[PDB]
UniProtKB/Swiss-Prot annotation:
Gene Ontology MF: a single term: mannosyl-glycoprotein endo-beta-N-acetylglucosaminidase activity
Functional summary from the UniProt entry: Endohydrolysis of the di-N-acetylchitobiosyl unit in high-mannose glycopeptides and glycoproteins. Hydrolyzes bi- and triantennary glycans. The presence of a core-bound fucose greatly augments endo F3 activity on biantennary and, presumably, triantennary oligosaccharides.
Gene of this entry: endOF3
Full protein name: Endo-beta-N-acetylglucosaminidase F3
Ranges for domain GH18: 2-283
InterPro entries linked: Endoglyc_F3 (IPR054978), EndoS_F2-like_TIM-barrel (IPR057016), Glyco_hydro18_cat (IPR001223), Glycoside_hydrolase_SF (IPR017853)
NCBIfam families: Endoglyc_F3
Keyword entries, A-Z: Glycoprotein, Glycosidase, Hydrolase, Secreted, Signal
Reactions the enzyme catalyzes: an N(4)-(oligosaccharide-(1->3)-[oligosaccharide-(1->6)]-beta-D-Man-(1->4)-beta-D-GlcNAc-(1->4)-alpha-D-GlcNAc)-L-asparaginyl-[protein] + H2O = an oligosaccharide-(1->3)-[oligosaccharide-(1->6)]-beta-D-Man-(1->4)-D-GlcNAc + N(4)-(N-acetyl-beta-D-glucosaminyl)-L-asparaginyl-[protein]
Gene Ontology biological process terms, A to Z: carbohydrate metabolic process
Post-translational modification: Carbohydrate at Thr-42 consists of (2-OMe)Man1-4GlcNAcU1-4GlcU1-4Glc1-4(2-OMe)GlcU1-4[(2-OMe)Rham1-2]Man.
Sugar-modified residues: 42
């Protein structure tokens, strides 16, 4: 019985399925697409358009969020890694501490959200040297996802500062999760440093079968030393074609022990698909 984490991309797709329509047996919802800078300054992106396409206005967004929380569903904000994380001015703030405070100020202080999930896969400087990727048998991936970036010290500082307000060691029960892949350059160093801070660690194993997820599990647990109970796999509902596999992964208990659960990308892309995955990981 794992967790069921639902991504709700706010780009207006499948509009009749409102954020508040997230069904029961869904533990958390991660607002996705919508950027934290829109939560920060609500006047820049008109409601009902772009990444606010899913809502009539910011008030509508705010109201639906509460609708989920009052039902006990945690609502997290997606935060994407960015090349500015590798600089001394992450997010254009003065330091990683400043960046961290800002995220805390916007996501928690202002929007009273339950935490954040880090989508780690964006471009930036590659590591140097680039290590030899272990390979498929060892990780479930063929090689590096060349479009990701190195977890340089500056990049690590950002996450470190964020762990002060989000995650297992932060106060006020705030979630800190990550959605990435063993193939992203920054993976290993992120886990060497913060695996224990993450409540859940999601692998974007879109389109995988149980065999491939197990391969990932072998590495995540054996080499990255991640507790099996934090591992969450990705159900690619957006694709609409891998449900049977997703359902199997959802029901599946890795050889290393009970996993954290499943995340669904995205629940609102195909509700029936998402419900099946939810049902599978829950029952
Ligand atoms: C966890 C995970 O799975 N990770 C990723 C997945 O995210 C990814 O799935 C796709 O995600 C896209 C969203 O990505 C953006 O948001 C996330 C979360 O914040 C970011 O991580 C990601 O990087 C994207 O954000 C980007 O941020 C950067 C900066 O932060 C922006 O760049 C800046 O831009 C400014 C300009 O202002 C300036 O130039 C700066 O210099 C520059 O840095 C960048 O703009 C921004 N990118 C975006 C997109 O905003 C989804 O969009 C994507 O969904 C589309 O594609 C999939 C294919 O996989 C389709 O299945 C799906 O149907 C969809 O198609 C689009 O659907 C929408 C839904 O409605 C349609 O919208 C309609 O559009 C109409 C006009 O065309 C009307 O407006 C209408 O009202 C509206 O509803 C749209 O028409 C469809 N068109 C497209 C694009 O096909 C998918 O979910 C996956 C797969 O790549 O990878 C995982 O690893």
């Amino acid at each position: 019985n794992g967790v069921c984490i639902a991504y709700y991309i706010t780009d207006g797709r499948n509009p009749t399925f409102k954020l508040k329509d997230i069904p029961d047996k869904v533990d958390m919802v991660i607002l996705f697409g919508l950027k934290y800078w829109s939560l920060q300054d609500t006047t820049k992106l008109p409601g009902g358009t772009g990444m606010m396409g899913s809502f009539k206005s910011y008030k509508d967004l705010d109201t639906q969020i509460r609708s989920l929380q009052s039902r006990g569903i945690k609502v997290l904000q997606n935060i994407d890694d960015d090349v500015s994380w590798q600089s001394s001015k992450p997010g254009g703030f003065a330091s990683a501490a400043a960046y961290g405070d800002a995220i805390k100020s916007i996501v928690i202080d202002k929007w009273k959200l339950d935490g954040i999930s880090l989508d780690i896969e964006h471009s930036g400087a590659k590591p140097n040297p680039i290590p030899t990727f272990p390979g498929y048998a060892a990780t479930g991936y063929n090689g590096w996802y060349s479009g990701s970036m190195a977890a340089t010290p500056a990049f690590l500082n950002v996450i470190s500062e964020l762990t002060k307000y989000f995650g297992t060691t932060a106060p006020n029960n705030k979630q800190l999760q990550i959605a990435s892949g063993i193939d992203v350059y920054a993976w290993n160093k992120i886990m060497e440093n913060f695996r224990n801070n993450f409540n859940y660690i999601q692998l974007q194993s879109y389109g995988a079968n149980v065999s491939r997820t197990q391969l990932m599990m072998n590495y995540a647990t054996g080499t990255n030393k991640i507790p099996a109970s934090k591992m969450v796999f990705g159900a690619y509902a957006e694709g609409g074609t891998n449900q049977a596999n997703d359902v199997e992964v959802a029901k599946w208990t890795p050889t290393q022990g009970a996993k954290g659960g499943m995340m669904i990308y995205t629940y609102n892309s195909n509700v029936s698909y998402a419900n099946a995955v939810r049902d599978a990981v829950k029952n």
